[PDB]
Amino acid sequence: AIIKEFMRFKVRMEGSVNGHEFEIEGEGEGRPYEGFQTVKLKVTKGGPLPFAWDILSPQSKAYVKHPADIPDYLKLSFPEGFKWERVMNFEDGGVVTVTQDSSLQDGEFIYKVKLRGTNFPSDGPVMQKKTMGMEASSERMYPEDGALKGEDKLRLKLKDGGHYTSEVKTTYKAKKPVQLPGAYIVDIKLDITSHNEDYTIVEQYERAEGRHSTG
């Protein structure tokens, strides 16, 4: 009974993008079983960021709605929790690597994130802030080597019409070997609900629901 129907979380990211170091702190809340959440974030060091918010926005899988018949591996991992490791390869040679620890302390999730972005063209859409959010996506989930893997193609919206593509691969590993699901799909929509002019303060909303594959 330790994941309640309403849960809050605290997050700190230590990051570097093309050598620009920054820190972000945030707090969020949501309904883990209903698959939605919100977060309020502030850049506490290295603001304003000289790159697009949208590469940071996808950096909280306890809050995915799962039907009863798909094991909710990442909720089962608590109280100890889980770790994740991610690579994002962007279509113009930019690369983001991320590691994250998720734990539960005094009834709140605690998130610790380390991020490195490199090889973004100084004049590309990320370093020139030409993105305006991302499309809804479907993360393709499967068990492998005792972990849960996810693969997605993120389509960052360009202001000028069009999309800037990232292939994303993530490993989500519970700190104790609770029940893995079979292969399945998680439909996700992440929205930036508000921001200040320079994106030193940002609010996000996400909805996520697991389902069986069609095909």
Side-chain angles (χ1 to χ4, degrees), residues 165-198:
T165 295
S166 191
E167 71 172 341
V168 183
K169 299 202 189 287
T170 312
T171 302
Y172 311 88
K173 190 155 176 69
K175 291 165 183 176
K176 63 184 175 187
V178 289
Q179 188 181 4
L180 282 163
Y184 78 107
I185 309 297
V186 177
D187 297 317
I188 304 162
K189 190 168 191 334
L190 190 160
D191 305 320
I192 306 312
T193 58
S194 69
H195 60 86
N196 67 355
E197 173 69 7
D198 64 2

PDB file of all heavy atoms in Angstrom, residues 165-198:
ATOM      1  N   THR A 165      14.064  15.328 -34.890  1.00  0.00           N
ATOM      2  CA  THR A 165      13.862  13.915 -34.471  1.00  0.00           C
ATOM      3  C   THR A 165      14.945  13.498 -33.490  1.00  0.00           C
ATOM      4  O   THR A 165      16.135  13.813 -33.733  1.00  0.00           O
ATOM      5  CB  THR A 165      13.818  12.953 -35.667  1.00  0.00           C
ATOM      6  OG1 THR A 165      12.664  13.337 -36.379  1.00  0.00           O
ATOM      7  CG2 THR A 165      13.691  11.510 -35.248  1.00  0.00           C
ATOM      8  N   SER A 166      14.525  12.764 -32.456  1.00  0.00           N
ATOM      9  CA  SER A 166      15.438  12.117 -31.487  1.00  0.00           C
ATOM     10  C   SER A 166      15.047  10.642 -31.370  1.00  0.00           C
ATOM     11  O   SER A 166      13.905  10.365 -31.203  1.00  0.00           O
ATOM     12  CB  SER A 166      15.364  12.808 -30.152  1.00  0.00           C
ATOM     13  OG  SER A 166      16.407  12.374 -29.289  1.00  0.00           O
ATOM     14  N   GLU A 167      15.967   9.723 -31.581  1.00  0.00           N
ATOM     15  CA  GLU A 167      15.740   8.311 -31.196  1.00  0.00           C
ATOM     16  C   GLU A 167      16.181   8.137 -29.745  1.00  0.00           C
ATOM     17  O   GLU A 167      17.232   8.639 -29.352  1.00  0.00           O
ATOM     18  CB  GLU A 167      16.458   7.384 -32.144  1.00  0.00           C
ATOM     19  CG  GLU A 167      17.936   7.393 -31.990  1.00  0.00           C
ATOM     20  CD  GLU A 167      18.640   6.316 -32.807  1.00  0.00           C
ATOM     21  OE1 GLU A 167      17.964   5.315 -33.218  1.00  0.00           O
ATOM     22  OE2 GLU A 167      19.848   6.513 -33.064  1.00  0.00           O
ATOM     23  N   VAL A 168      15.323   7.544 -28.962  1.00  0.00           N
ATOM     24  CA  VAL A 168      15.541   7.429 -27.496  1.00  0.00           C
ATOM     25  C   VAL A 168      15.512   5.971 -27.094  1.00  0.00           C
ATOM     26  O   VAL A 168      14.557   5.271 -27.421  1.00  0.00           O
ATOM     27  CB  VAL A 168      14.460   8.228 -26.752  1.00  0.00           C
ATOM     28  CG1 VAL A 168      14.707   8.176 -25.246  1.00  0.00           C
ATOM     29  CG2 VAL A 168      14.465   9.660 -27.275  1.00  0.00           C
ATOM     30  N   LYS A 169      16.521   5.550 -26.331  1.00  0.00           N
ATOM     31  CA  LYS A 169      16.542   4.194 -25.779  1.00  0.00           C
ATOM     32  C   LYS A 169      16.788   4.354 -24.289  1.00  0.00           C
ATOM     33  O   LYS A 169      17.756   5.072 -23.925  1.00  0.00           O
ATOM     34  CB  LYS A 169      17.638   3.356 -26.453  1.00  0.00           C
ATOM     35  CG  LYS A 169      17.490   3.175 -27.953  1.00  0.00           C
ATOM     36  CD  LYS A 169      18.216   1.973 -28.575  1.00  0.00           C
ATOM     37  CE  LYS A 169      18.180   1.994 -30.100  1.00  0.00           C
ATOM     38  NZ  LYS A 169      16.838   1.660 -30.655  1.00  0.00           N
ATOM     39  N   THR A 170      15.971   3.699 -23.479  1.00  0.00           N
ATOM     40  CA  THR A 170      16.097   3.816 -22.023  1.00  0.00           C
ATOM     41  C   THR A 170      16.047   2.422 -21.391  1.00  0.00           C
ATOM     42  O   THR A 170      15.271   1.574 -21.853  1.00  0.00           O
ATOM     43  CB  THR A 170      14.976   4.676 -21.437  1.00  0.00           C
ATOM     44  OG1 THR A 170      14.861   5.892 -22.194  1.00  0.00           O
ATOM     45  CG2 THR A 170      15.255   4.990 -19.987  1.00  0.00           C
ATOM     46  N   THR A 171      16.886   2.201 -20.403  1.00  0.00           N
ATOM     47  CA  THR A 171      16.788   1.011 -19.540  1.00  0.00           C
ATOM     48  C   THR A 171      16.272   1.442 -18.172  1.00  0.00           C
ATOM     49  O   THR A 171      16.900   2.314 -17.548  1.00  0.00           O
ATOM     50  CB  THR A 171      18.121   0.265 -19.450  1.00  0.00           C
ATOM     51  OG1 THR A 171      18.528  -0.111 -20.772  1.00  0.00           O
ATOM     52  CG2 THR A 171      18.005  -0.951 -18.556  1.00  0.00           C
ATOM     53  N   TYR A 172      15.171   0.841 -17.735  1.00  0.00           N
ATOM     54  CA  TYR A 172      14.554   1.091 -16.410  1.00  0.00           C
ATOM     55  C   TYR A 172      14.793  -0.157 -15.572  1.00  0.00           C
ATOM     56  O   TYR A 172      14.297  -1.203 -15.923  1.00  0.00           O
ATOM     57  CB  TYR A 172      13.073   1.432 -16.514  1.00  0.00           C
ATOM     58  CG  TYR A 172      12.706   2.488 -17.530  1.00  0.00           C
ATOM     59  CD1 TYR A 172      12.439   2.183 -18.857  1.00  0.00           C
ATOM     60  CD2 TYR A 172      12.636   3.822 -17.172  1.00  0.00           C
ATOM     61  CE1 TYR A 172      12.122   3.159 -19.785  1.00  0.00           C
ATOM     62  CE2 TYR A 172      12.315   4.828 -18.092  1.00  0.00           C
ATOM     63  CZ  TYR A 172      12.029   4.494 -19.408  1.00  0.00           C
ATOM     64  OH  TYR A 172      11.757   5.475 -20.338  1.00  0.00           O
ATOM     65  N   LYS A 173      15.582  -0.065 -14.504  1.00  0.00           N
ATOM     66  CA  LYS A 173      15.964  -1.276 -13.721  1.00  0.00           C
ATOM     67  C   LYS A 173      15.511  -1.075 -12.285  1.00  0.00           C
ATOM     68  O   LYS A 173      16.036  -0.157 -11.569  1.00  0.00           O
ATOM     69  CB  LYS A 173      17.469  -1.567 -13.786  1.00  0.00           C
ATOM     70  CG  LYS A 173      17.809  -2.947 -13.192  1.00  0.00           C
ATOM     71  CD  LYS A 173      19.035  -3.668 -13.612  1.00  0.00           C
ATOM     72  CE  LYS A 173      19.167  -4.941 -12.795  1.00  0.00           C
ATOM     73  NZ  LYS A 173      18.130  -5.933 -13.142  1.00  0.00           N
ATOM     74  N   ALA A 174      14.590  -1.930 -11.853  1.00  0.00           N
ATOM     75  CA  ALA A 174      14.188  -1.995 -10.438  1.00  0.00           C
ATOM     76  C   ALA A 174      15.402  -2.385  -9.582  1.00  0.00           C
ATOM     77  O   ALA A 174      16.240  -3.186 -10.018  1.00  0.00           O
ATOM     78  CB  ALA A 174      13.081  -2.991 -10.299  1.00  0.00           C
ATOM     79  N   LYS A 175      15.448  -1.857  -8.359  1.00  0.00           N
ATOM     80  CA  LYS A 175      16.542  -2.165  -7.409  1.00  0.00           C
ATOM     81  C   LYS A 175      16.336  -3.536  -6.777  1.00  0.00           C
ATOM     82  O   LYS A 175      17.273  -4.007  -6.148  1.00  0.00           O
ATOM     83  CB  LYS A 175      16.611  -1.066  -6.359  1.00  0.00           C
ATOM     84  CG  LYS A 175      17.088   0.256  -6.938  1.00  0.00           C
ATOM     85  CD  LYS A 175      16.817   1.399  -5.992  1.00  0.00           C
ATOM     86  CE  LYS A 175      17.208   2.746  -6.550  1.00  0.00           C
ATOM     87  NZ  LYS A 175      16.831   3.841  -5.632  1.00  0.00           N
ATOM     88  N   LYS A 176      15.173  -4.161  -6.994  1.00  0.00           N
ATOM     89  CA  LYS A 176      14.890  -5.551  -6.562  1.00  0.00           C
ATOM     90  C   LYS A 176      14.100  -6.218  -7.684  1.00  0.00           C
ATOM     91  O   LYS A 176      13.386  -5.539  -8.420  1.00  0.00           O
ATOM     92  CB  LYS A 176      14.178  -5.550  -5.219  1.00  0.00           C
ATOM     93  CG  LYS A 176      12.832  -4.880  -5.263  1.00  0.00           C
ATOM     94  CD  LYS A 176      12.135  -4.770  -3.924  1.00  0.00           C
ATOM     95  CE  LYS A 176      10.864  -3.965  -4.091  1.00  0.00           C
ATOM     96  NZ  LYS A 176      10.210  -3.676  -2.805  1.00  0.00           N
ATOM     97  N   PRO A 177      14.314  -7.528  -7.943  1.00  0.00           N
ATOM     98  CA  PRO A 177      13.742  -8.162  -9.145  1.00  0.00           C
ATOM     99  C   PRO A 177      12.252  -8.530  -9.001  1.00  0.00           C
ATOM    100  O   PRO A 177      11.896  -9.664  -8.908  1.00  0.00           O
ATOM    101  CB  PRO A 177      14.636  -9.390  -9.300  1.00  0.00           C
ATOM    102  CG  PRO A 177      15.067  -9.721  -7.894  1.00  0.00           C
ATOM    103  CD  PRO A 177      15.293  -8.378  -7.241  1.00  0.00           C
ATOM    104  N   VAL A 178      11.406  -7.513  -8.991  1.00  0.00           N
ATOM    105  CA  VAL A 178       9.931  -7.670  -9.059  1.00  0.00           C
ATOM    106  C   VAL A 178       9.514  -8.024 -10.481  1.00  0.00           C
ATOM    107  O   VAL A 178      10.343  -8.040 -11.411  1.00  0.00           O
ATOM    108  CB  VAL A 178       9.294  -6.393  -8.512  1.00  0.00           C
ATOM    109  CG1 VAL A 178       9.498  -6.312  -6.996  1.00  0.00           C
ATOM    110  CG2 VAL A 178       9.800  -5.159  -9.239  1.00  0.00           C
ATOM    111  N   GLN A 179       8.248  -8.340 -10.642  1.00  0.00           N
ATOM    112  CA  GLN A 179       7.703  -8.959 -11.864  1.00  0.00           C
ATOM    113  C   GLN A 179       7.822  -8.022 -13.067  1.00  0.00           C
ATOM    114  O   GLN A 179       7.275  -6.920 -13.037  1.00  0.00           O
ATOM    115  CB  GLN A 179       6.248  -9.360 -11.620  1.00  0.00           C
ATOM    116  CG  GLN A 179       5.730 -10.184 -12.798  1.00  0.00           C
ATOM    117  CD  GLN A 179       4.291 -10.597 -12.667  1.00  0.00           C
ATOM    118  OE1 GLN A 179       3.605 -10.229 -11.722  1.00  0.00           O
ATOM    119  NE2 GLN A 179       3.811 -11.314 -13.671  1.00  0.00           N
ATOM    120  N   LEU A 180       8.506  -8.478 -14.110  1.00  0.00           N
ATOM    121  CA  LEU A 180       8.555  -7.779 -15.409  1.00  0.00           C
ATOM    122  C   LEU A 180       7.295  -8.082 -16.193  1.00  0.00           C
ATOM    123  O   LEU A 180       6.765  -9.189 -16.123  1.00  0.00           O
ATOM    124  CB  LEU A 180       9.781  -8.243 -16.201  1.00  0.00           C
ATOM    125  CG  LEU A 180      11.093  -7.613 -15.759  1.00  0.00           C
ATOM    126  CD1 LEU A 180      12.259  -8.432 -16.304  1.00  0.00           C
ATOM    127  CD2 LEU A 180      11.165  -6.151 -16.216  1.00  0.00           C
ATOM    128  N   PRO A 181       6.802  -7.077 -16.941  1.00  0.00           N
ATOM    129  CA  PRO A 181       5.734  -7.297 -17.927  1.00  0.00           C
ATOM    130  C   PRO A 181       6.319  -7.953 -19.175  1.00  0.00           C
ATOM    131  O   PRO A 181       7.532  -8.035 -19.323  1.00  0.00           O
ATOM    132  CB  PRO A 181       5.304  -5.852 -18.215  1.00  0.00           C
ATOM    133  CG  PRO A 181       6.604  -5.082 -18.180  1.00  0.00           C
ATOM    134  CD  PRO A 181       7.360  -5.716 -17.030  1.00  0.00           C
ATOM    135  N   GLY A 182       5.424  -8.420 -20.041  1.00  0.00           N
ATOM    136  CA  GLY A 182       5.747  -8.703 -21.436  1.00  0.00           C
ATOM    137  C   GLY A 182       5.870  -7.421 -22.227  1.00  0.00           C
ATOM    138  O   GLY A 182       5.755  -6.321 -21.652  1.00  0.00           O
ATOM    139  N   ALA A 183       6.146  -7.535 -23.514  1.00  0.00           N
ATOM    140  CA  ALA A 183       6.254  -6.347 -24.388  1.00  0.00           C
ATOM    141  C   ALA A 183       4.893  -5.649 -24.404  1.00  0.00           C
ATOM    142  O   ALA A 183       3.836  -6.332 -24.519  1.00  0.00           O
ATOM    143  CB  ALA A 183       6.690  -6.729 -25.781  1.00  0.00           C
ATOM    144  N   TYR A 184       4.904  -4.343 -24.335  1.00  0.00           N
ATOM    145  CA  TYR A 184       3.671  -3.516 -24.353  1.00  0.00           C
ATOM    146  C   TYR A 184       4.028  -2.099 -24.781  1.00  0.00           C
ATOM    147  O   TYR A 184       5.171  -1.806 -25.101  1.00  0.00           O
ATOM    148  CB  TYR A 184       2.908  -3.653 -23.035  1.00  0.00           C
ATOM    149  CG  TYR A 184       3.473  -2.857 -21.880  1.00  0.00           C
ATOM    150  CD1 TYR A 184       2.836  -1.710 -21.405  1.00  0.00           C
ATOM    151  CD2 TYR A 184       4.657  -3.218 -21.274  1.00  0.00           C
ATOM    152  CE1 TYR A 184       3.323  -0.988 -20.320  1.00  0.00           C
ATOM    153  CE2 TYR A 184       5.187  -2.486 -20.207  1.00  0.00           C
ATOM    154  CZ  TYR A 184       4.506  -1.383 -19.705  1.00  0.00           C
ATOM    155  OH  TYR A 184       4.985  -0.680 -18.627  1.00  0.00           O
ATOM    156  N   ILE A 185       3.038  -1.228 -24.826  1.00  0.00           N
ATOM    157  CA  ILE A 185       3.191   0.157 -25.332  1.00  0.00           C
ATOM    158  C   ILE A 185       2.692   1.126 -24.278  1.00  0.00           C
ATOM    159  O   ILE A 185       1.640   0.887 -23.726  1.00  0.00           O
ATOM    160  CB  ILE A 185       2.377   0.382 -26.626  1.00  0.00           C
ATOM    161  CG1 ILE A 185       2.635  -0.678 -27.695  1.00  0.00           C
ATOM    162  CG2 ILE A 185       2.599   1.783 -27.185  1.00  0.00           C
ATOM    163  CD1 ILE A 185       4.002  -0.739 -28.196  1.00  0.00           C
ATOM    164  N   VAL A 186       3.399   2.234 -24.116  1.00  0.00           N
ATOM    165  CA  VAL A 186       2.932   3.346 -23.227  1.00  0.00           C
ATOM    166  C   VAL A 186       2.726   4.608 -24.089  1.00  0.00           C
ATOM    167  O   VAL A 186       3.673   5.057 -24.728  1.00  0.00           O
ATOM    168  CB  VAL A 186       3.915   3.603 -22.077  1.00  0.00           C
ATOM    169  CG1 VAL A 186       3.438   4.788 -21.256  1.00  0.00           C
ATOM    170  CG2 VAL A 186       4.112   2.376 -21.201  1.00  0.00           C
ATOM    171  N   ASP A 187       1.475   5.017 -24.214  1.00  0.00           N
ATOM    172  CA  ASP A 187       1.101   6.247 -24.931  1.00  0.00           C
ATOM    173  C   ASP A 187       1.332   7.408 -23.968  1.00  0.00           C
ATOM    174  O   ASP A 187       0.805   7.334 -22.823  1.00  0.00           O
ATOM    175  CB  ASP A 187      -0.335   6.195 -25.434  1.00  0.00           C
ATOM    176  CG  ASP A 187      -0.593   5.101 -26.459  1.00  0.00           C
ATOM    177  OD1 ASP A 187       0.232   4.910 -27.354  1.00  0.00           O
ATOM    178  OD2 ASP A 187      -1.598   4.412 -26.338  1.00  0.00           O
ATOM    179  N   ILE A 188       2.066   8.425 -24.435  1.00  0.00           N
ATOM    180  CA  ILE A 188       2.503   9.567 -23.586  1.00  0.00           C
ATOM    181  C   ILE A 188       2.242  10.880 -24.323  1.00  0.00           C
ATOM    182  O   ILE A 188       2.536  10.970 -25.511  1.00  0.00           O
ATOM    183  CB  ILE A 188       4.008   9.412 -23.258  1.00  0.00           C
ATOM    184  CG1 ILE A 188       4.307   8.068 -22.583  1.00  0.00           C
ATOM    185  CG2 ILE A 188       4.461  10.590 -22.417  1.00  0.00           C
ATOM    186  CD1 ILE A 188       5.764   7.657 -22.629  1.00  0.00           C
ATOM    187  N   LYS A 189       1.733  11.879 -23.590  1.00  0.00           N
ATOM    188  CA  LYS A 189       1.730  13.259 -24.059  1.00  0.00           C
ATOM    189  C   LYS A 189       2.307  14.155 -22.959  1.00  0.00           C
ATOM    190  O   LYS A 189       1.738  14.189 -21.874  1.00  0.00           O
ATOM    191  CB  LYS A 189       0.328  13.705 -24.441  1.00  0.00           C
ATOM    192  CG  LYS A 189       0.255  15.047 -25.154  1.00  0.00           C
ATOM    193  CD  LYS A 189      -1.114  15.300 -25.762  1.00  0.00           C
ATOM    194  CE  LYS A 189      -1.170  16.485 -26.712  1.00  0.00           C
ATOM    195  NZ  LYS A 189      -0.130  17.499 -26.431  1.00  0.00           N
ATOM    196  N   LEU A 190       3.379  14.860 -23.287  1.00  0.00           N
ATOM    197  CA  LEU A 190       4.017  15.841 -22.381  1.00  0.00           C
ATOM    198  C   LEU A 190       3.759  17.243 -22.925  1.00  0.00           C
ATOM    199  O   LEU A 190       4.074  17.487 -24.108  1.00  0.00           O
ATOM    200  CB  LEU A 190       5.508  15.530 -22.281  1.00  0.00           C
ATOM    201  CG  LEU A 190       6.274  16.288 -21.199  1.00  0.00           C
ATOM    202  CD1 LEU A 190       7.574  15.556 -20.869  1.00  0.00           C
ATOM    203  CD2 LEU A 190       6.526  17.739 -21.606  1.00  0.00           C
ATOM    204  N   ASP A 191       3.180  18.091 -22.086  1.00  0.00           N
ATOM    205  CA  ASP A 191       2.863  19.505 -22.432  1.00  0.00           C
ATOM    206  C   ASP A 191       3.634  20.436 -21.499  1.00  0.00           C
ATOM    207  O   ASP A 191       3.650  20.183 -20.289  1.00  0.00           O
ATOM    208  CB  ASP A 191       1.373  19.810 -22.257  1.00  0.00           C
ATOM    209  CG  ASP A 191       0.435  18.893 -23.026  1.00  0.00           C
ATOM    210  OD1 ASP A 191       0.748  18.546 -24.192  1.00  0.00           O
ATOM    211  OD2 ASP A 191      -0.648  18.576 -22.460  1.00  0.00           O
ATOM    212  N   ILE A 192       4.184  21.512 -22.030  1.00  0.00           N
ATOM    213  CA  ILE A 192       4.677  22.667 -21.220  1.00  0.00           C
ATOM    214  C   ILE A 192       3.468  23.570 -21.011  1.00  0.00           C
ATOM    215  O   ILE A 192       2.964  24.125 -21.974  1.00  0.00           O
ATOM    216  CB  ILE A 192       5.800  23.408 -21.959  1.00  0.00           C
ATOM    217  CG1 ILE A 192       6.935  22.464 -22.370  1.00  0.00           C
ATOM    218  CG2 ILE A 192       6.247  24.626 -21.123  1.00  0.00           C
ATOM    219  CD1 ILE A 192       7.435  21.544 -21.321  1.00  0.00           C
ATOM    220  N   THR A 193       2.968  23.633 -19.804  1.00  0.00           N
ATOM    221  CA  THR A 193       1.709  24.354 -19.498  1.00  0.00           C
ATOM    222  C   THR A 193       1.946  25.848 -19.246  1.00  0.00           C
ATOM    223  O   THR A 193       1.010  26.630 -19.420  1.00  0.00           O
ATOM    224  CB  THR A 193       0.986  23.670 -18.347  1.00  0.00           C
ATOM    225  OG1 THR A 193       1.856  23.657 -17.226  1.00  0.00           O
ATOM    226  CG2 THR A 193       0.556  22.271 -18.716  1.00  0.00           C
ATOM    227  N   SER A 194       3.124  26.205 -18.760  1.00  0.00           N
ATOM    228  CA  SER A 194       3.507  27.616 -18.560  1.00  0.00           C
ATOM    229  C   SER A 194       5.027  27.708 -18.482  1.00  0.00           C
ATOM    230  O   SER A 194       5.723  26.745 -18.086  1.00  0.00           O
ATOM    231  CB  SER A 194       2.790  28.284 -17.352  1.00  0.00           C
ATOM    232  OG  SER A 194       3.232  27.760 -16.092  1.00  0.00           O
ATOM    233  N   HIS A 195       5.547  28.880 -18.820  1.00  0.00           N
ATOM    234  CA  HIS A 195       6.993  29.155 -18.672  1.00  0.00           C
ATOM    235  C   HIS A 195       7.184  30.652 -18.579  1.00  0.00           C
ATOM    236  O   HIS A 195       6.352  31.395 -19.127  1.00  0.00           O
ATOM    237  CB  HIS A 195       7.833  28.564 -19.808  1.00  0.00           C
ATOM    238  CG  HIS A 195       7.434  29.102 -21.148  1.00  0.00           C
ATOM    239  ND1 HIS A 195       7.944  30.266 -21.659  1.00  0.00           N
ATOM    240  CD2 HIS A 195       6.559  28.637 -22.079  1.00  0.00           C
ATOM    241  CE1 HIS A 195       7.439  30.470 -22.872  1.00  0.00           C
ATOM    242  NE2 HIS A 195       6.558  29.512 -23.135  1.00  0.00           N
ATOM    243  N   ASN A 196       8.245  31.071 -17.915  1.00  0.00           N
ATOM    244  CA  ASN A 196       8.618  32.495 -18.032  1.00  0.00           C
ATOM    245  C   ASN A 196       9.375  32.725 -19.361  1.00  0.00           C
ATOM    246  O   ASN A 196       9.681  31.734 -20.066  1.00  0.00           O
ATOM    247  CB  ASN A 196       9.284  32.974 -16.749  1.00  0.00           C
ATOM    248  CG  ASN A 196      10.619  32.349 -16.498  1.00  0.00           C
ATOM    249  OD1 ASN A 196      11.035  31.462 -17.249  1.00  0.00           O
ATOM    250  ND2 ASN A 196      11.293  32.859 -15.464  1.00  0.00           N
ATOM    251  N   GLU A 197       9.675  33.996 -19.705  1.00  0.00           N
ATOM    252  CA  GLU A 197      10.226  34.355 -21.044  1.00  0.00           C
ATOM    253  C   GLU A 197      11.499  33.552 -21.319  1.00  0.00           C
ATOM    254  O   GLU A 197      11.653  33.094 -22.489  1.00  0.00           O
ATOM    255  CB  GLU A 197      10.562  35.845 -21.173  1.00  0.00           C
ATOM    256  CG  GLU A 197      11.278  36.194 -22.480  1.00  0.00           C
ATOM    257  CD  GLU A 197      10.393  36.065 -23.705  1.00  0.00           C
ATOM    258  OE1 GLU A 197       9.163  35.820 -23.518  1.00  0.00           O
ATOM    259  OE2 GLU A 197      10.927  36.207 -24.843  1.00  0.00           O
ATOM    260  N   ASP A 198      12.359  33.349 -20.312  1.00  0.00           N
ATOM    261  CA  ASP A 198      13.706  32.738 -20.562  1.00  0.00           C
ATOM    262  C   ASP A 198      13.765  31.287 -20.095  1.00  0.00           C
ATOM    263  O   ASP A 198      14.899  30.739 -20.000  1.00  0.00           O
ATOM    264  CB  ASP A 198      14.846  33.545 -19.941  1.00  0.00           C
ATOM    265  CG  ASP A 198      14.838  33.627 -18.427  1.00  0.00           C
ATOM    266  OD1 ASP A 198      13.949  33.014 -17.800  1.00  0.00           O
ATOM    267  OD2 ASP A 198      15.717  34.317 -17.893  1.00  0.00           O
TER     268      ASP A 198
END
